[PDB]
């Protein structure tokens, strides 16, 4: 077997027993790896209807076939778990060197249960695998958290995953963050790992991955990055303005979010662009683990330093969704929310919900004394409760209980911008209909990219269409999507290599590092083997698909107010069932087992 | 001699020559010390019209009598030198510890001649008086200058004076810091430091002060003391919030600077006020050498951490001065000018004649770039160019200059809220004629603190007048204020004792320490005989009553646009000429021999 070592580590915190199980190339054959080995393993032991925070639910850290290899991108991994922030499945991507790392240490996965009686950390130094101490460290800082391991275990090259005092303190937002700046950031990820008192994961390695044809594998591998470095997206835009050169895109083109959600153009959007941050603020690029792209960003301010990121994601809901022009509180802003833990996205989206509530009035200048007024463009806000927010102080308590939950607590639930209680992204529905089906059907929540179709709509790969075309053909791109995604994902690459590569070229690459003689059509059922086995799980966990996949009323009901799609709103009725029966589910938006049976998933039923 | 040691150092840096000079009880009987002392060192022995930044320019460095005593708030100093900013004299008064030790090592005041050839730091240890390199430290902050400069000497007693980069860069508008966050801060003082390549001075003493008679000296600050104990401003208000009490004070009474002194209340003054600061990031108090007030603010922001300050004017000067209401934004402003050296008010008053420059169409984006626009209301700008002022990099070369020669260079120097060309502070004349008087007089341009007259016609003391009365006894209380503050400033004390104590408690705690009889009347003509001194070194440099004694027109034909003032202009006009008679004066501004004489400093006419 190569590719995959066929072993991953079982760790039972409650018992405190280690031990490395192992599996066939048969199962690999299956569910390729990562994010699909993940939600096998899930499926096959634990209870869909478990408590999120309960020492039942399992944390699952997975490497792909490719992560660890010559691969371009191969570095990445994935963290899944049932979240505690919306009750269904929950995948979290995340770059760096982590990812690689594990696979040099001889291992896939981790599969964590249970829960220590006081803080511990993990340290994995090849066989050697250990559970410590970490009294002395829980409380602090991801930064902080690194540094101190780095040093008891005296080793540099010792790559850590921690979650921050967010994670320490529950908060339904919380990431787990590796490398610094790199965020397997929604979902809850990081409430799960707290909950099990598992402050970190340390790993070094010193391990070459198995490739099965390694002069062939180097062959396809110079072909790749040719293509990636010869596209305009992937050879240009990304490594020199990072993934924020969208902010000038999207808000040309009338859906970039503000004020949570009112409205699809921002004036003062080029202050917080790529090509802004480029000319005030960025030091160079930086790429994760084998990557030719180079798109993370290494800033620096007189006020906080030097610091990575902010993503695009990440200054919209931090700045123009909160109707904040300025780009350095909003980098600050970010650098926060990494070091203390916290989604980004989910931060500024439970930050607009609070401003709408507040423009609103039903949360008076009298609930937060002295405290910022959540008053739209008040970049004191900023600066003042995202700390509150990962230590559950003050009114940070219930903003530590996301968007939804804030809102609803207010008899508003009608002003929380998200899908199945995951807050939405940087991209207006009204804009792009195709990704607003993508909203309501994604496995995690109202989540962007695990099925990016504004890749299609608006930026033109695998190529141009309208974002207003409602049709089967608009579907099945976006099942394309979600499929491919699923495959990208799990085999361990980054999902921007479709910014040059395509269905084809993934199966190139993975035969010749795993030694097999699958077709595009193999490896893309494998994906759809995996988005099903994930609507499972919800289902089984007790999703509603008529009440769970929808869209806000704003996006159904209220006409985008201005820019070029101004009057539109997203026509969801129509497209949902077509969805459904081209999905091979029932109308009521069900799998029947004869679709388990084709996908060889029927155990399961 | 008792309170003075009758010794100083003289060091001349283009050679690195060093003098211990003695002087006599007759001398400090003129002059009394600190301020006073100063001035009549560079009347006798410097060329008023020597070139601020040539090497002829020197720097006094000199604290007073009280200074290192136990006299309640006795230990500040002065830092006295022509200013490259305004041309004329400045006195640049601050606290700390640093002025407490230098009167330990056994020295009142330290001349600084000439210029290093290279940079170089003065070390005082007692006796020990040696000029270091200082090659590795420049280009330093304050606290990195600080912390090198403790672990070279090996001593973390010694206190440091210093420059940073502003000072180093000769910005008009540098400062001298000391003890971290204490500032001699207008004038250009750090800039005349940095043009004589003098980085630091690090002192460290072991002497006591000698008191003519402690154990009545002893008394005598008991019953001062507790006079400050029971007032209500030195005894709660100072403590408890600061000198940011009085934003929202100065707010209600409709004088409070708004967007360049276009108008005088600010709708969210609140959120900057001492209390929200006290509510929000304060930690704790902290006082001065010798201080029972301790009005020092101790603040810790997620973003910087703990830093000290903002006090009054720097919560106005980078806050409703510029349309700006974050209380979080302006502390990281105020810990940056700290930091690079940079006074608080002329960095805002320059950033402030930017802003309007700019809404008025005479900064022009196409000359920005990419840096952020000077749009009210955009806390971009103090994130983004106070480093920049401070290396003179891209447009922060040219905001280097300050407010007049920025304005000036545009073509509208009418946009400058500049007297001498030094930046008015947080208190529109509009609402206090009396205190507009005193900008269009004061010594060092427009400045309130050498002559606060917002005492009287807004707090209270000595007593309430009225802010609209501009009768002669408005001007006497004026002059008072003037000779008064030049006496305290000299004593080696801190203003703020002002609330509780008067003219007879200074002389009480001067006569107890000195072993004089002097009487209140003999004081305050010290005070009287160092204000016309500065004025006939001012004349000398130069200054044109007609011309340089005035308010931007603004305030002479702007009336209020709204508030308690409504309406208001400075009449100034009239307050003038009887301003020049009371104080002796001739009807064009100009000192006659007669009165030269009966002051006793006819020998610099
Ligand atoms: S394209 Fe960006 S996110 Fe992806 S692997 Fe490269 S540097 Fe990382
Ligand atoms: S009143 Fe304030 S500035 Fe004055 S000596 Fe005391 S702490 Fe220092
Ligand atoms: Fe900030
Ligand atoms: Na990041
Ligand atoms: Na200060």
């Known amino acids: 077997m190569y590719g995959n070592w066929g ?112 803080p511990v950390y993990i340290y994995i130094k090849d066989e050697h695998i250990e559970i410590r101490d970490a009294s002395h460290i829980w409380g602090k800082k991801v930064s902080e958290t690194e540094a101190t391991i780095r040093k008891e275990v005296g080793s540099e090259k010792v790559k850590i995953a921690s979650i921050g005092p967010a994670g320490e303190n529950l908060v339904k937002f919380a990431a787990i963050m590796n490398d610094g700046h790199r965020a397997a950031g929604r979902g809850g990820v990081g409430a799960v790992m707290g909950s099990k008192n598992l402050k970190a994961i340390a790993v ?151 401003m709408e509530l507040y423009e609103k009035g039903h949360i008076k200048d009298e609930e937060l004394g002295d405290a910022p007024p959540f008053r739209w463009g008040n970049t004191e806000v900023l600066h003042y409760y995202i700390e509150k927010i990962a230590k559950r102080e003050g009114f940070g308590d219930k903003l530590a209980e996301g968007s939804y ?82 495959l990208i994902d799990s085999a361990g690459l980054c999902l921007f290599t479709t910014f040059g590569l395509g269905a084809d070229d993934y199966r190139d690459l993975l035969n010749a590092a795993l030694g097999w003689d699958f077709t595009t059509e193999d490896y893309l059922k494998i994906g759809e083997r995996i988005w099903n086995a994930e609507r499972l799980f919800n289902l089984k966990a007790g999703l509603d698909p008529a009440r769970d996949d929808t869209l806000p009323k704003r996006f159904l009901e209220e006409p985008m107010p201005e820019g070029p799609n101004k009057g539109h709103t997203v026509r969801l009725k129509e497209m949902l069932p077509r969805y459904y029966k081209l999905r091979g589910w029932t109308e009521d938006g069900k799998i029947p087992k004869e679709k388990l049976e084709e996908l060889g998933i029927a155990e399961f039923y």
Request: hydrophobic share 35%; aromatic share 8%; glycine share 12%.
């Open 7 to 118: 072993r991953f580590i079982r760790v039972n915190l409650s018992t405190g027993d280690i031990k490395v199980e192992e599996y066939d190339e048969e199962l690999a054959k299956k569910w390729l790896g990562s994010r699909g080995l993940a939600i096998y393993l899930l499926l096959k032991e634990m209870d869909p209807t478990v408590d999120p925070l309960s020492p039942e639910n399992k944390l699952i850290i997975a490497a792909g076939p490719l992560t660890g290899t010559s691969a371009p991108t191969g570095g990445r991994y994935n963290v899944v778990t049932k979240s505690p922030l919306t009750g269904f499945i929950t995948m979290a991507n995340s770059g760096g060197y982590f990812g690689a790392e594990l696979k040099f240490a001889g291992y896939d996965a981790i599969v964590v249960e249970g829960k220590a009686e006081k």
């Open 204 to 354: 070094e390695g010193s391990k070459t991955v198995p490739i099965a044809d390694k002069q062939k594998f180097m062959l396809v591998v110079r072909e790749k990055v040719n293509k990636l470095r010869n596209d305009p997206v992937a050879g240009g835009g990304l490594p020199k303005y990072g993934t924020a050169v969208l902010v000038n895109i999207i808000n040309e083109n009338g859906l970039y979010p503000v004020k949570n959600f009112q409205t699809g153009v921002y004036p003062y959007a080029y202050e917080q662009s790529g090509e802004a941050m480029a000319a005030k603020y960025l030091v160079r690029n930086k790429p994760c683990y084998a990557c030719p792209i180079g798109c993370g960003r290494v800033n620096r301010l007189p006020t906080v330093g030097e610091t990575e990121g902010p993503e695009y994601e990440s200054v919209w809901a931090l700045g123009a969704n909160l109707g904040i022009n300025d780009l350095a509180s909003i980098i600050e802003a970010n650098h926060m929310c990494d070091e203390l833990g916290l989604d980004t996205i989910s931060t500024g989206g439970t930050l607009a919900t609070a």
């Open 405 to 486: 939950r804030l809102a609803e607590s207010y008899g508003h639930p009608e002003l929380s911008m998200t899908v199945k209680k995951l807050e939405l992204p940087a991209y207006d529905p009204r804009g792009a209909e195709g990704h607003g089906l993508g909203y309501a059907t994604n496995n995690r929540g109202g989540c962007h990219i695990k099925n990016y179709m504004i890749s299609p709509e608006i930026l033109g790969y695998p190529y141009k269409m309208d974002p207003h075309d409602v049709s089967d053909d608009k579907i099945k791109m976006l099942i394309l999507f979600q499929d491919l995604t699923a």
